[PDB]
Curated annotation (Swiss-Prot), chain A:
CC annotations in GO: cytoplasm
Gene from which this protein is expressed: OTU2
TM annotation in the entry: none
Full protein name: OTU domain-containing protein 2
Coiled coil segments of this chain: none
Residue ranges annotated for the OTU domain, each copy included: 48-188
Note: Present with 172 molecules/cell in log phase SD medium.
Domain of life according to the entry: Eukaryota
Gene Ontology MF term list: cysteine-type deubiquitinase activity
From Swiss-Prot, chain B:
InterPro entries assigned: Ribosomal_eS7, Ribosomal_eS7_CS
Cross-link (Glycyl lysine isopeptide (Lys-Gly) (interchain with G-Cter in ubiquitin)): K80, K81, K121
Domain of life: Eukaryota
Ribonucleoprotein as UniProt keyword: yes
Organism: Saccharomyces cerevisiae (strain ATCC 204508 / S288c) (Baker's yeast)
One of the record's GO cellular component terms: 90S preribosome
Short name of one Pfam family: Ribosomal_S7e
Keyword Ubl conjugation: yes
Record-stated family: Belongs to the eukaryotic ribosomal protein eS7 family.
Protein name stated in the entry: Small ribosomal subunit protein eS7A
Major location category of this protein: cytoplasm
Subunit structure as annotated in this protein's UniProt entry: Component of the small ribosomal subunit (SSU). Mature yeast ribosomes consist of a small (40S) and a large (60S) subunit. The 40S small subunit contains 1 molecule of ribosomal RNA (18S rRNA) and 33 different proteins (encoded by 57 genes). The large 60S subunit contains 3 rRNA molecules (25S, 5.8S and 5S rRNA) and 46 different proteins (encoded by 81 genes). Interacts with snoRNA U3. uS11 interacts with MPP10. Component of the ribosomal small subunit (SSU) processome composed of at least 40 protein subunits and snoRNA U3.
GO BP field: cytoplasmic translation; ribosomal small subunit biogenesis; ribosome biogenesis; rRNA processing
Upper classification of the organism: Eukaryota, Fungi, Dikarya, Ascomycota, Saccharomycotina
UniProtKB/Swiss-Prot annotation, chain C:
Cross-link (Glycyl lysine isopeptide (Gly-Lys) (interchain with K-? in acceptor proteins)): G76
Residues in Ubiquitin-like domain copies: 1-76
Protein name: Ubiquitin
TM regions (residue ranges): none
Species for this entry: Saccharomyces cerevisiae (strain ATCC 204508 / S288c)
Gene encoding the protein: RPS31
Length: 188, 184, 76
């Protein structure tokens, strides 16, 4: 049977190359485990447990809405509000301050001056990632303070002058190897 | 390279997801060389009623257990990498036609190569982390048949937003309408 | 030379720098003064984003000037 021999040969070749690259994988270090350990140490220091959030890039708005619902009172919170409603509120806040959003829409990493109205429409009507300036504007509009804890970086606080309770979330860059991901943090 | 992850046919979007594949390969050494041996045959775009299109990634059949080991993780990175998208992995299986009376015999057709068998297989492969607990077929008075699939209530959080995507891709691939239910 | 940088959170950072200092040097100074990594900050002056590998005062950046520091934080 030449076919069973061919099958065994290709299986042995796949296993050998898998072990050969597994040696290089074991040689390389993992920033994900170190970032997870540092985030666990920071969460143990802050005594608040991290809550998982959904992928596809709507994690920022969903985590902000979940942290605001955990922080604010149930009477002040509205059931009609959603992640798309939060993106629309961020777009309306960007339209409220067009001059500040215009310098925020221009990005050195993107190397082009994007329009503020186009960026607001892309944030409201598409699943692209919301900017830090748009998230800060939405937090200032909803008057809930936003606390961002990053592993290996100092803790950041935005919109702390708002009357509503502070919202805690963590953005981890190495936890997802593709890029940064935001997860809401609830007090335990 | 991006050409190695692609099996036969190169177009632009499969080259993009091959670049995403090798970017996930070089990063995350805990899953490195678990995703290295596998290649995928083709990519298909499915339009859904929700407006977020679906990546039907057709892969070789014998390599399917390797995707089954790491499928949750690579699907999570694939939803993150592409906005307004839902990714699904299917195995491109061969359907052999039913031999008629006039036709010459071409060996014996195996029962895994029939149309209903591969349709049930791709229906299972749509919902991977869940397990199907039952099926039903509604025979309506108009003559239409709508197949209802019952899913086990455990770990449905992975796929609960993607059910209408499953309905759209199954309606495109097989021409049959299905409705998912979760018995509780 | 003393310059001021306005952040997205609202804090104004006073940086003591030179008129022949690189943008990467200004990012390293911001990292040493606030802990923000240089790969996450973007500098802007007079509505134009500051490019790396360029010195100060080439875009009329003088003493007691106001620049903008924007954190990316693209987490989704």
């Amino acid at each position: 049977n030449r076919q069973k021999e061919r099958l065994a040969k290709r299986d042995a070749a796949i296993a050998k190359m898998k072990e050969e690259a597994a040696l290089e994988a074991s040689k390389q270090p993992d920033l994900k485990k170190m970032e997870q350990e540092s985030i666990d140490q920071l969460c143990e220091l802050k005594k608040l447990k991290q809550f998982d959030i959904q992928p596809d890039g709507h994690s920022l708005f969903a985590s902000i809405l979940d942290q605001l619902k955990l922080r604010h009172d149930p009477k002040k919170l509205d059931q009609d509000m959603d992640v798309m409603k939060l993106r629309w509120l961020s777009c309306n806040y960007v339209q409220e301050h067009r001059d500040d959003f215009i310098p925020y829409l221009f990005d050195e990493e993107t190397m082009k001056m994007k329009d503020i109205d186009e960026y607001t429409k892309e944030m409201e009507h598409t699943a692209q990632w919301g900017g830090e300036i748009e998230i800060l504007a939405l937090s200032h509009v909803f008057d809930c303070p936003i606390s961002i804890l990053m592993s290996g970086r100092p803790i950041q606080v935005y919109n702390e002058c708002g009357k509503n309770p502070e919202l805690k979330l963590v953005y981890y860059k190495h936890s997802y190897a593709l890029g940064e991901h935001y997860n809401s943090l609830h007090d335990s | 390279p991006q050409a190695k992850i692609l099996s036969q046919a190169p177009t632009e979007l499969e080259l993009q997801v091959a670049q995403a594949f090798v970017e996930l390969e070089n990063s995350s050494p805990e899953l490195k060389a678990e995703l290295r041996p596998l290649q995928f045959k083709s990519i298909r775009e499915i339009d859904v009623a929700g407006g977020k299109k679906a990546l039907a990634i057709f892969v070789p059949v014998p390599s399917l257990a390797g995707f089954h080991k790491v499928q949750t993780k690579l699907t999570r990175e694939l939803e993150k990498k592409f906005q307004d998208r839902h990714v699904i992995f299917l195995a491109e299986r061969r359907i052999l036609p039913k031999p008629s009376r006039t036709s010459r015999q071409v060996q014996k057709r195996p029962r895994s190569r029939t149309l209903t068998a591969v349709h049930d297989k791709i229906l299972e492969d749509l919902v991977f982390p869940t397990e199907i607990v039952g099926k039903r077929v509604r025979y309506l008075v108009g003559g239409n048949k709508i197949q209802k699939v019952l899913l086990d209530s455990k770990d449905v959080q992975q796929i609960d937003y993607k059910l209408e995507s499953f309905q759209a891709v199954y309606n495109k691939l097989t021409g049959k309408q299905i409705v998912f239910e979760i018995p509780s | 030379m003393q310059i001021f940088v306005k952040t997205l959170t609202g804090k104004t950072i006073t940086l003591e720098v030179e008129p022949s200092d690189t943008i990467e040097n200004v990012k390293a100074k911001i990292q040493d003064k606030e802990g923000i990594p240089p790969d996450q900050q973007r500098l802007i002056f007079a509505g134009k984003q500051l490019e790396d590998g360029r010195t100060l005062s080439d875009y009329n950046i003088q003493k007691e000037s106001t620049l903008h520091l924007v954190l990316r934080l693209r987490g989704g």
